[PDB]
């Protein structure tokens, strides 16, 4: 591993790769193939699939990737030049997109794994969008190509058609999400791998042409690879490739030279091992011992393909020619993630990726020890070299240039290079690499930034992870023994550390809350919290989603509020926002950092907003990208702007607090526009302090929201179901009972399975997958992800509604029951009087 250590010092020979894709698409099996390539003593069992990255017992028992597992290996390319690959094996389940997001931050490129039998599934599209928006290089690896042969039994022309359709759909998705023309993915460009991780098949056009060149000779494999795809027919008469088929039954070059040999190889083993297999192996130059020809059909296929295809070089060619090195990709990484940007002195220094310089390591994942007591931060070294025993300054997530309180000085303990089951204990790690850091557990929660303890004051932090999904499922947790509450709290902070998207909060009633993305996510969280960490019995409440509050009409009364000294009066109203405006604000289409001219132009052009009103916007939402707008509609002729602006920060903060904690429940306020009509401001600066304006602003926000007709908004899941033709009716029946409506049921091209797309409420989605699989005998599998917020039917404030104890309420009674029970669980009053 000395060559591995020396390879770390050369940032040009390093690849930071994230393996991403839908659930059970072969990513883990592909990493197992790579490890088997690099580790001779690690061999997959004949029947049991080796799962080298799946080190968690939950992952082994569930058979589903849960947490990302880093792998650092030395992988030779086609030309025999060894590289240093930092590979992240991100889980493919849609509920665990937080691990994918954490992996994408410390990575420069993306290898997208797609099942050959399946099309482009939900998580495939979601991760394509995330990787494009994270400004990463995208490379496709169409896996499980053996399915098209041994399972679908398609003709080679139809296998080519299926692969081409997959590539076309991926290209369309990338074009829709991105704008760059050079993001077209095609095996001719070297962006696409065809692989079968079960049988150790992995090749591009370049590598397979290299196989030809090594066998036949006198062939330019680089030039021959440019002909092995598309409608480029081969003419045996002229020995040249033409775009026109020379004969009626002429096949494509890809089919004739790649798919036909693959079909024949996979057909002379599964059916003709007894006779004509040794002849075929001799024709291919493959020699197998007597005891190796006695293996079963599947191990025999794996061995034959390992002999014929050898090492994995097409994948390495893809990741070297298209995924930029840390030095090359540092500048877009700093431009996107770093708060200061590339313009800052450090931002310029980061783009150099010098192993000697200002240490700035960004960690996005935290891996726990065997006992669970200690956590090891894991992240990329973006500048400088970290050392064992070296003190460091560990910036937090609220750290800024002003406060400098979120940071903390810590001593770096042992350092490791993590490869799944074993770690290489190192003494130093240069820039552009991935390192396991110990002795840094305590100050790090979620993401963090590590810098030198002294000498670097310009150092800001990196932007925290922007997860692709919102954690809306909420479960309450209490210990069986109330005397063991501190142990449960320690377990809660541990699971918060170990889960990027987890949110543990305490309600005003003392109820501990865990926020999750789905049933499997929270099941894994609870299993961890019980078995590891806390090591105590814990009671779990019934899962309940988190709601949001909006207004469907403008407030009919000019609500007013006054400070305790009565020297300041604010008049405000609340009205619903325009359709699609809240989504644009949340999606960072428009930012608070924009100058007022461009903001006004955007609001006037794309939303027909008046110039006077558009240029008067004060703040956005509860947070910087919150889906609420505060508009200063005060007439300048009535109230002095300079006097009004003296308390602008305080009223903005009060607005943000009020939109964070709604009147109806302690829930976020969404899709509400607030207009300041009259604002009497005191002249003396003692009477217009923050402690007076902020509560008054919150009270006036509450009054404006309540007078306007309020409604509860609930999260809706988007569900993609893989079911056969006969199981679609059962899917319809199951979705009907849970307020779910189907938006699309389209057959999968190249497969007999259908895909039903539907929207289901997140509160009716509990047990939805279990019901779907039980009612369809396991033939219908579904994945649910949060899509949008929808208004709960009924009137939340209707006091005439009667709620039965243990009976589901009708549609008009849904909002009232939701609000009452949410208030009861939160510990607030029975109902909200409009007066307050």
């Amino acid at each position: 591993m000395d060559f591995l250590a020396d390879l770390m010092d050369n940032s040009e020979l390093i690849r930071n790769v994230t393996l991403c894709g839908h659930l059970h698409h072969g990513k883990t099996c592909f990493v197992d193939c790579l490890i088997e390539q690099t580790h001779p003593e690690i061999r997959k069992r004949y029947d049991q699939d080796l799962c080298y990255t799946d080190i968690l017992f939950t992952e082994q028992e569930r058979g589903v990737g849960i947490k990302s597992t880093p792998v650092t290996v030395v992988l030779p390319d086609t030309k025999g030049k060894s590289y240093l690959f930092n590979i992240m094996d991100t889980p493919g389940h849609v509920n665990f997109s937080d691990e994918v997001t954490a992996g994408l931050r410390i990575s420069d490129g993306v290898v997208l794994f797609i099942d050959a039998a399946e099309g482009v599934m939900l998580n495939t599209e979601r991760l394509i969008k995330h990787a494009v928006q994270e400004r990463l290089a995208v490379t496709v690896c169409i896996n499980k190509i053996d399915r098209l042969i041994l399972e679908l039994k398609l003709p080679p022309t139809d296998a080519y058609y299926k692969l081409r359709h997959i590539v076309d759909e991926v290209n369309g998705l990338i074009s829709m999400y991105s704008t760059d023309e050079n993001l077209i993915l095609s095996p001719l460009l070297g962006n696409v791998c065809f692989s079968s991780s079960q049988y150790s098949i992995c090749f591009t056009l370049g590598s397979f042409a290299k196989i030809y060149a090594d066998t036949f000779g006198d062939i330019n494999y680089q030039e021959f690879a440019k002909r092995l795809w598309g409608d480029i027919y081969f003419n045996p008469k002229t020995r040249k490739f033409t775009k026109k088929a020379p004969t009626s039954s002429s096949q494509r070059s890809f089919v004739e030279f790649i798919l036909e040999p693959l079909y024949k190889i996979l057909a002379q083993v599964v059916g003709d091992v007894d006779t004509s297999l040794p002849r075929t192996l001799d024709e291919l130059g493959i020699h197998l011992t007597k005891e190796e020809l006695k293996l079963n059909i599947r191990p025999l296929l794996r061995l034959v393909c390992k002999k014929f295809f050898g090492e994995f070089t097409g994948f390495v060619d893809m990741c070297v020619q298209h995924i930029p090195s840390p030095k090359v990709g540092a500048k877009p990484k700093i431009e996107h993630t770093y708060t200061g940007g590339v313009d800052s002195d450090l931002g310029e220094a980061m783009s150099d990726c010098d192993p000697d310089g200002p240490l700035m390591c960004h960690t996005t994942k935290m891996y726990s020890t065997d006992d669970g007591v200690q956590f090891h931060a894991f992240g990329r070294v973006l500048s400088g070299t970290i050392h064992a025993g070296q003190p460091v300054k560990v910036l937090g997530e609220n750290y800024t240039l002003e406060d400098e309180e979120d940071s903390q000085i810590c001593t770096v303990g042992r350092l490791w290079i993590s490869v799944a089951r074993y770690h290489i204990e190192v003494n130093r790690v240069p820039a552009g690499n991935w390192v396991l850091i110990e002795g840094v557990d305590q100050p790090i929660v979620k993401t963090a930034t590590i810098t030198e303890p002294r000498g670097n004051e310009e150092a800001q932090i990196f932007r925290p992870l922007k997860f692709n999904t919102t954690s809306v499922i909420k479960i309450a947790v209490e210990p069986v023994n109330p005397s063991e509450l501190p142990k449960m709290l320690d377990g809660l902070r541990k699971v918060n550390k170990s889960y990027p998207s987890l949110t543990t909060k305490v309600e005003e009633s003392g109820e501990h809350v865990i926020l999750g993305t789905g049933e499997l996510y929270l099941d894994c969280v609870m299993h961890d919290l019980r078995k590891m960490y806390s090591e105590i019995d814990i009671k779990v409440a019934d899962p309940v989603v988190t709601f949001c509050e909006t207004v469907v009409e403008t407030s009919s009364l000019k609500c007013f509020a006054e400070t305790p000294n009565k020297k300041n009066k604010i008049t405000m109203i609340a009205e619903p926002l325009e359709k699609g405006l809240a989504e644009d604000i949340e999606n960072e289409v428009v930012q608070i950092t924009w100058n007022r001219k461009k903001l006004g132009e955007f609001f006037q052009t794309k939303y027909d907003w008046d110039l006077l009103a558009a240029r008067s916007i004060w703040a956005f939402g509860p947070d910087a990208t919150g889906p609420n707008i505060l508009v200063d509609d005060t007439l300048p002729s009535e109230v002095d702007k300079a006097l009004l602006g003296s308390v602008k920060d305080s009223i903005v903060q009060g607005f943000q607090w009020g939109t964070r904690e709604g009147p109806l429940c302690d829930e976020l306020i969404r899709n509400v526009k607030f207009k300041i009509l009259d604002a009497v401001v005191a002249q003396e600066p003692l009477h217009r302090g923050g402690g007076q304006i902020i509560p008054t602003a919150r009270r006036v926000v509450y009054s404006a929201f309540l007078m306007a007709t309020p409604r509860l908004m609930e999260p809706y899941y988007f569900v993609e179901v893989q079911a056969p033709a006969d199981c679609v009716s059962a899917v319809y029946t199951v979705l009907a009972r849970r307020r779910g409506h189907v938006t699309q049921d389209a057959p999968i091209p190249g497969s007999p399975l259908y895909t039903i797309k539907a929207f289901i409420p997140a509160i009716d989605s509990f047990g939805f997958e279990t019901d779907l699989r039980t009612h369809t005998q396991g033939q219908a599998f579904s994945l649910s992800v949060f899509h949008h917020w929808q208004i709960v039917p009924g009137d939340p404030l209707d006091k005439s509604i009667v709620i039965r104890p243990l009976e589901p309420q009708p549609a008009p009674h849904l909002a009232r029951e939701f609000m009452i029970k949410t208030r009861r669980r939160k510990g607030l009053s029975e109902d909200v009087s409009i007066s307050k």
């Binding site: 059916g271 003709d272 007894d274």
Partner: protein
């Protein structure tokens, strides 16, 4: 049927079939068996019920 059941027809319905065929068994101890794919397919078709 002599046509489709040919891989198994000769030694089927015999006590310890292929016991003396050293190609398909280790020996008279009757411990291991190595069967060709046609025989396995014929047996699989004969046992669909």
């Amino acid at each position: 049927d002599p046509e489709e059941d040919a891989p198994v027809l000769d030694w089927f319905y015999d006590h310890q079939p292929l016991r003396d065929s050293r190609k398909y068994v280790n020996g008279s101890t009757y411990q291991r068996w190595q069967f060709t794919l046609p025989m396995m397919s014929t047996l699989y078709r004969l046992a669909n019920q």
